[PDB]
């Protein structure tokens, strides 16, 4: 170890003025300092358990403004423990500096900190909660108490135990018995019997529960017996109550909030600022009251529409959902703070108003949280349907022209797939979108402005999408603002190149550009306004790599994001570094070929051609609307 240690401590002599000039620059500036904030916290989490690294860090930690750490509350609640001895021990205290000055910011993250499955986090949480309780006038006790109502209602027990039951038949079958009946079905009924048989309206929740119970008896008999009669009894009884549930999940819509939970609705005018919307630079806007009934969106996931009165008279609208922890999304929206700040530095970027539309993300479990309900927005998918349906054009004509030319489409050769795709495309107009945007808009003078803002906001996320690797761009995963014409984006489940990896219909695309969008842009096509907006953004990125690469490297290497990445893709640190290596190919023009440095114009031209291959397009799945 001595060779790498001597190197690491001669490196630490370099780290000393690195850290010092970082801290004094972090004193001298705001915003951009976050690159430095990340890097010092990084080298600390990397190597801080040596006392000689602790020397460089601790004096600067103890001689820099609190506001520094308000930049990293989520990035620092991520690994709230950071378990290595003097590292975690000092970070516990450092988080209780925010847990002295600014509890209204920290308290949602401290709610998150409560309910780790593994021990480590839960312990740092209980320490830091009760360190903060006195420093914060027992605000913690009010806020955790309130949040505990919301956490329980959040994936309201009924839809969960229904879905677990429907899943359980699709688990026990064949010979893998435990996965369905044993594991789901008794814990399910136990978690009706405590939970919604008490902290929801007992009897009517028990309206399903009382037939789920008689199937549960036969299930409990089978669990221990192994008598194959108990199995078929348990299943047939479950099929009967499942069939009752099967008719009612389709037609619940709006739900009285105390019947959603009798403690919910009833809290008022709190010691809490509105859910992570607020910040301590402003006078408080406080949770005052709640919408009387919360509303299941008519979708496969069944999220709840909500709104909260703030003490300032505003209403703040949220969508309550969960099948993954929103932190991953939060960190994607956090990076957009930086990219917006880059475009705000350059005079021509600034003059042309360029930015990404970030939106509010508030995680509350491994599954769930609140998402900000954006106003004024419709999916790109819905609008095409509206236009076609209102005109009484046959909705999905293009797939039908393909099948009528050849029903064999999906197993044709390369060039035959292309030929039939070209034929169905050439037999169909490709500009419904251009028409509906004009029709919808009031008058030409507004419409021209809208077309411009549409074009530019599309161009911006053409570049950041391509840098990130982002895919799954079917038009039900795109959204449009009906006042400005700005585009908006709504899923990031697979950010990196792995969209190209998907085995059946690989998303063989750098970013989505397509005939209805291009035909909705100017009659000139993309050269001029679009192409030049692409150049300016890529120049600004080609330049400020130290900022963007720091945020990327920090996020992408992260030992806890590595479990999100084992859910996304795939130590993984190597694949993470390979992604950063490929980003550094995109830096130069080595992305097209590993030998080459290319100018921005040449890089963009090759990128456009990659985004217009007929072959790639008719290797998206037909449900991706590659005809549009």
């Amino acid at each position: 170890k001595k060779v790498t240690e001597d190197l690491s401590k001669t490196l630490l002599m370099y780290t000393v003025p690195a850290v010092q000039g970082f801290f004094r620059s972090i004193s001298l500036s705001r915003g951009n300092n976050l690159q430095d904030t990340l890097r010092v916290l990084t080298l600390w989490f990397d190597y801080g358990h040596w006392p000689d690294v602790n020397e460089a860090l601790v004096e600067g930690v103890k001689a820099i403004q609190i506001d520094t750490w308000l930049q990293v509350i989520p990035q620092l609640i991520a690994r709230i423990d950071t378990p290595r001895p003097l590292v975690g021990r000092l970070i516990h205290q450092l988080l209780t500096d925010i847990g002295r000055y600014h509890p209204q910011a920290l308290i949602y993250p401290l709610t998150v900190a409560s309910k780790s499955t593994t021990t480590a986090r839960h312990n740092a949480a209980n320490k830091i909660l009760k360190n903060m309780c006195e420093h914060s006038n027992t605000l913690v006790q009010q806020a955790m108490m309130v949040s505990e109502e919301l956490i329980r209602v959040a994936i309201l027990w009924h839809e969960m135990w229904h879905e677990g039951l429907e899943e359980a038949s699709r688990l026990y079958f064949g010979e893998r018995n435990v996965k369905g009946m044993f594991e789901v079905l008794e814990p399910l009924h136990a978690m009706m019997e405590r939970g919604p048989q008490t902290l929801k309206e007992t009897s009517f929740n028990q309206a399903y529960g009382r037939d789920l119970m008689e199937a549960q008896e036969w299930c409990r008999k089978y669990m221990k017996s192994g008598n194959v009669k108990d199995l078929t009894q348990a299943w047939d009884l479950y099929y009967h109550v499942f069939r009752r549930i099967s008719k009612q999940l389709p037609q619940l819509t709006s739900l009285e909030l105390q019947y959603v939970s009798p403690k919910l609705l009833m809290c008022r005018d709190l010691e809490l600022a509105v859910p992570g919307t607020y910040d301590p630079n402003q006078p408080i806007i406080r949770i005052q009251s709640i919408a009387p009934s919360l509303q299941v969106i008519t979708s496969k996931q069944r999220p709840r529409k909500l709104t909260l009165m703030g003490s300032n008279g505003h209403e703040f609208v949220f969508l309550l959902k969960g099948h993954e922890d929103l932190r991953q999304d939060e960190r994607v929206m956090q990076l957009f703070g930086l990219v917006n700040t880059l475009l705000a530095n350059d005079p021509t970027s600034l003059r042309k108003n360029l930015s990404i539309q970030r939106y509010a993300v508030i995680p509350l479990s491994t599954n769930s949280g609140l998402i900000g309900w954006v106003p004024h927005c419709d999916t790109l998918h819905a609008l095409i349907r509206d236009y076609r349906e209102k005109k009484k054009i046959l909705l999905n004509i293009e797939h039908r022209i393909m099948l009528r030319m050849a029903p064999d489409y999906d197993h044709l050769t390369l060039m035959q797939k292309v030929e039939v795709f070209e034929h169905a495309v050439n037999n169909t107009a490709g500009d419904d979108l251009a028409k509906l945007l004009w029709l919808k808009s009031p008058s030409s003078e507004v419409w021209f402005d809208r077309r411009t803002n549409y074009t530019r906001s599309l161009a911006v996320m053409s570049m950041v999408g391509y840098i990130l690797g982002l895919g799954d761009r079917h038009p039900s995963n795109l959204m449009l603002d009906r006042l400005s014409g700005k585009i908006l984006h709504i899923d990031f489940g697979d950010c990196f190149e792995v969209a190209m990896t998907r085995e059946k219909f690989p998303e063989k695309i750098p970013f989505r550009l397509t005939r209805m969008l291009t035909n909705a842009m100017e009659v000139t096509g993309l050269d001029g306004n679009y192409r030049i907006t692409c150049h300016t953004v890529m120049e600004v990125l080609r330049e400020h790599k130290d900022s963007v690469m720091a945020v990327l490297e920090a996020f992408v290497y992260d030992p806890l994001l590595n479990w999100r990445l084992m859910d996304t893709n795939t130590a993984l640190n190597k694949k993470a570094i390979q992604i950063i290596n490929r980003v550094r190919d995109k830096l130069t023009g080595r992305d097209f070929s590993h030998d080459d440095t290319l100018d921005v114009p040449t890089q963009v031209e090759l990128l456009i051609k990659q985004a217009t291959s007929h072959e790639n397009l008719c290797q998206c799945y037909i449900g991706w609307c590659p005809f549009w």
Partner: protein, 317 residues
């Protein structure tokens, strides 16, 4: 059926294999592929038998029996089998198919498994005849002209125009010239050059052919080797003098009106008589029989339920 000295063999996208006594103007028998899209059809030049190939499958049948079922079957290349031929004596089948593993298969005895394998990084996009029957011409999704010895992997892997999958190739019947075809719309012709050492062929460049706007599909010689045809997604078959591989005459279905462009993406050509006739896989509902050099349309056959995928032919022993 099989006794006729001139037989037309075909499929539509409907993939049913349609066999015409060529003089007749009727599909005299039909073999009902409705499992998998046809990817090649391969009647023996001896007029006796056919290997019929499609997605995941090849099967072996006679020409003289009415609507036959598989006498031998071939399976496991669970991909598009874009080209099929033989060890020319009829001992083995050869297949270019879009698994990473092209194959030699038994026609000496009943076997479903391949007699041998050729393995490549990128899956296999085309094949052609090679006269020694100690190598095979192979082409693929790496764009590499894998002329390949049948056991050693002594191989050519040449790429004349950069990177792209080579869509087809063919040899001179007298094996002095070889033409290689690409998705970029082009063909490149290289002089066949010989080595007894190792077990592998050599190529030297001859002619550069930017033949079409649209993607170049297939080429074939007249039986006298005097002409080489080349044909495309572009709706026309251009005929070259073998001497310098430049234009004699052209037979075209380039549409009378652009209201119906792709009257057909003609999927290549074959010949009949002593270079009297040229035939095309015309990608219209017609399989199309024409005269060479005169360039003129003689008989056309509409029996396919969907438009033509492939043309296979006999006017030979």
């Amino acid at each position: 059926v099989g006794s006729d000295p001139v037989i037309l063999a075909t499929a539509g996208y409907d993939h049913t294999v349609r066999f015409w006594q060529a003089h007749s103007g009727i599909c005299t028998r039909t073999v009902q592929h409705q499992d998998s899209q046809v990817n090649a059809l391969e009647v023996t030049p001896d007029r006796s038998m056919i290997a019929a190939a499609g997605y995941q499958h090849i099967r072996m049948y006679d020409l003289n029996s009415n609507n036959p079922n598989p006498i031998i079957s071939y399976d496991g290349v669970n991909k598009n089998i874009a080209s099929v031929g033989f060890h020319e004596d009829g001992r083995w089948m050869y297949t270019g198919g879009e698994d990473c593993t092209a194959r030699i298969w038994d026609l000496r005895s009943r076997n479903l498994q391949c007699q041998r394998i050729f393995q490549v990084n990128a899956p296999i996009n085309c094949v052609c005849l090679h006269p020694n029957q100690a190598e095979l011409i192979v082409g693929d999704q790496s764009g590499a002209i894998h002329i390949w010895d049948l056991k050693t992997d002594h191989n050519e892997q040449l790429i004349p125009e950069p990177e792209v999958s080579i869509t087809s190739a063919h040899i001179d019947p007298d094996a002095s010239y070889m033409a290689a075809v690409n998705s970029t719309g082009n063909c490149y012709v290289w002089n066949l050059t010989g080595g007894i050492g190792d077990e592998v062929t050599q190529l030297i460049p001859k002619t550069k052919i930017p033949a079409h706007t649209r993607y170049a599909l297939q080429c074939r010689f007249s039986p006298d080797s005097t002409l080489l045809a080349t044909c495309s997604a572009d709706q026309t078959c251009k005929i070259w003098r073998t001497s310098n591989f430049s234009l004699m005459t052209e037979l075209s279905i380039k549409s009378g009106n652009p209201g119906e462009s792709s009257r057909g993406w003609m999927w290549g050509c074959a010949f009949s008589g002593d270079s009297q006739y040229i035939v095309t896989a015309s990608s219209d509902n017609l399989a199309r029989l024409w005269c060479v050099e005169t360039g003129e349309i003689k008989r056309e056959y509409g029996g396919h339920q969907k438009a033509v995928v492939c043309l296979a032919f006999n006017d030979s022993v």
